[PDB]
């Protein structure tokens, strides 16, 4: 059994970017994505509609700029044998603190936590816990970095093994990177 999830976030359309990078629309096709988790900052119903045409399962949380505020601040949803926790990321003080993420996973008691305020992509394992910060799919600017590379992560979940394929557009090339996670 293979489950495909699209970890996204920080589109910021149109507050900071006109749309996704031209290639990322081509690399994304309807009927091939099983889940779509978004850290937030959709900023429009149009980006949510675009995601809704990419899959059926669309789990999306509240950012610091979302137009629709009915978005739950924190979400825990179970896929396969894993539970994924999703927050926007601006709740952690400071941003991207490993201590804050560990405390939030303690509150959630969740297998993997997603927190993507800092648009710079991150992926790390600490205390047998998995952590992914996909970054801005559209490469929306942030005060914490000088150069922001568009990026978006893809969960592939099979039983107890998750292989994460991260797509980052550098210059004009869509580099793809692989990371592996196994539940102890």
């Amino acid at each position: 059994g293979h489950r495909l999830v699209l970890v996204l976030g920080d589109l910021h359309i149109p507050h900071r970017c006109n749309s996704l990078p031209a290639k990322f629309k081509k690399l994304l096709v309807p009927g091939k994505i099983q889940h779509i988790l978004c850290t937030g900052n959709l900023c429009t119903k149009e980006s949510y509609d675009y995601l809704k045409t990419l899959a059926g399962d669309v789990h999306i949380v509240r950012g610091d700029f979302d137009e629709n505020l009915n978005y739950p601040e924190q979400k825990v949803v179970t896929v396969g044998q894993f539970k994924i926790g999703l927050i926007h990321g601006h709740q952690v003080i400071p941003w991207g603190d490993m201590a804050s993420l560990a405390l939030l996973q303690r509150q959630f008691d969740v297998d993997i936590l997603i927190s993507g305020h800092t648009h710079k992509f991150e992926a790390f394992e600490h205390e047998n816990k998995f952590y992914i910060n996909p970054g801005s799919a559209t490469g929306a600017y942030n005060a914490l970095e000088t150069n922001i590379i568009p990026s978006f992560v893809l969960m592939d979940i099979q039983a107890s093994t998750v292989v994460t394929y991260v797509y980052q557009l550098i210059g004009d090339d869509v580099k793809v990177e692989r990371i592996e996670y196994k539940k102890p």
Partner: protein, 802 residues
Amino acid sequence: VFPWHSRNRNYKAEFASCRLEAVPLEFGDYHPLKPVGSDFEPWTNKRGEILARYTTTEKLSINLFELLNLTQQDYVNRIEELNQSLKDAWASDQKVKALKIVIQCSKLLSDTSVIQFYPSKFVLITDILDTFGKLVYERIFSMCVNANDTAKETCLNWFFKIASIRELIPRFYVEASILKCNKFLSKTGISECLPRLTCMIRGIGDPLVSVYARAYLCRVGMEVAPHLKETLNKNFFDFLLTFKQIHGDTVQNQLVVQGVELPSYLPLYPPAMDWIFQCISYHAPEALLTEMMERCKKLGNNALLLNSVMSAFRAEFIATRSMDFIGMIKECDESGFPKHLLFRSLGLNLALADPPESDRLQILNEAWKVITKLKNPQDYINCAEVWVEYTCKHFTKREVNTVLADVIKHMTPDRAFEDSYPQLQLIIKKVIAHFHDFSVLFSVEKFLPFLDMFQKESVRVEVCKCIMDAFIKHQQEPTKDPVILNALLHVCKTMHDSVNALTLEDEKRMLSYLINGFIKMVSFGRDFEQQLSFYVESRSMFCNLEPVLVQLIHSVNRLAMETRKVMKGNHSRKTAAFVRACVAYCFITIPSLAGIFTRLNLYLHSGQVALANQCLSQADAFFKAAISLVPEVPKMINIDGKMRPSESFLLEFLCNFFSTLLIVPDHPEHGVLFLVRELLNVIQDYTWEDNSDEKIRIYTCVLHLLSAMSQETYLYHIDKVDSNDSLYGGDSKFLAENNKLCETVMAQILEHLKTLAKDEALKRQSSLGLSFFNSILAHGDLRNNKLNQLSVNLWHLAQRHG
């Protein structure tokens, strides 16, 4: 108590140790994202138009078996009463009464007391006939279950009773109503009865009655035996034989007696000829349509006939023969059927099927030479609405400009606009439908004067929304042609000036979306200053609509960061002034906003974008303004029209503010922890709800922030801003002041915990203790004996009360 010690954190080393090793992928490596029919227009639809158009205000009379001075609505009510009486009599086993009621209703069709009401009347009474026709049929069918002798006997009895009717028109109508029942007598009954009814229609001497009788016969034939077209062609041929009577002496004398002019008597005919021609020309071979065309041509005042020829025949046939139809239209008599109606029908045909390439220019020229000579504005717009589609579909922008200028010339004089607000809208839509590229549409010289025509407020704004939808859905790249900007600027002005106190929120949202769609698509290239000029003229132009202001703030911050990225952070003397101008722009712009939480969030984002360009003073001003705005937050806020609490939103706002003030440097002229100190004062002074404990959540967040900022090097840094880690260089005095703040915050938290314990609310106390222990584990140095003892005590207290 208990003091606070900050556990040493090495962010670089911790990240490097905890970072998962990743293996890149070369080309060829597998990653998941690797690559009668529907063409027949039924009579049910035409029912509505015939009933709607043909209404008379004169007093009608419905004589049965005597009633006088009846209005149209009362006439319809009386006919409905007759239909209900028919149904009740049939359901009560009184069939003779049903037959006599149907006979009288059909008799009503033989009377032409008010000619103008005859079409709608025909539509009403025929319904009764239909209600009869089915209702008889089912009965025989109910006896059927080559049917049994009882069904055949009942069918023959009905046919004989109907054949015994004296008056010709009632007999024809009642007999054609039950044509389907002929199925029960022989397999050739319909094929032997339809020609006989067609010939029987010749007895009707009044042309209008005969034509509508032919229309009913064709309708029954198509809803009963649509494979007998050879029989129904005789209807068209006999109709051409009878057509001489329409303009004959007898009908003229009848109209004179009734005092009805011919220009009003003639338009009563198309509702029936259109149906006759449509039924007879359905899937007909091209030879038959040709033969009908030449048989129509050879007559006299055939101006009327031609209309039906355009109204029924397939679009391809008329489009190919369009020049010949122009020729036929030209010699039509002026005093008879209007020529502009024929031109409208021809244009409607040419809107579906293209004419031959060699003839298009001649067709357009000769159509407009006749259209432009019309005096009445209403029929002129009726023709022009149809022909603008043709002109825009086939020809270039010059002809569209000429057509629009002609339309403006005709309608400007006598304030005719009010009579053609809908039609004109249609025209403008068509002009936009065929002109996608907006460097060409606004090159049309008279396009904007055409918009000036809509001087009404409600009508004009809808056209503006249509223009803006077309722009946002047919513009995939930023444009700069100043012709485009000025025109869309005018449209956005005239669409935004409709916002008032009475305007609904949803209308404001739609308008904001449209003007935002315009604003997003204006990109001045490397000329950042002129882009800021566009933004200042935009704020001056679009003041009322708040979301437009929000988008403008976001976009000017975007311009600031775009300049940052273009110049790679190395700000120049010329561009330092520009970025200062942009940030001052933003500073002026936020306070105008109406929403509160939007103001707070935009203040923060403005702050962060401000510090990104090494300009510190106005950033500190931003944080001070945000702090001063903090107390204004209400307890109860508005979301999506509903009312929701503002607790969690306030929590998240303060959390973001703290996380930001992590990096914010403190001015040397003031003390340490400055902006943090005023935020602490504000949050302490905030009128927190009695049943709310998120305040201690925020103090725990304060502890998190101070612990993180007490480290040697901060987790994240600005490109060229010296934060307190590099400004103070980890000074002992700064750390001591931070620790004193730690002790104050912990004392406040402990006092709140003791108050909660005294309040006997043990659930909240336990949750607070568990969260505080988690915070201490996060940041509190467990090596210190006092802090470890405090954490152990908090854990014990949390476990004591579950």
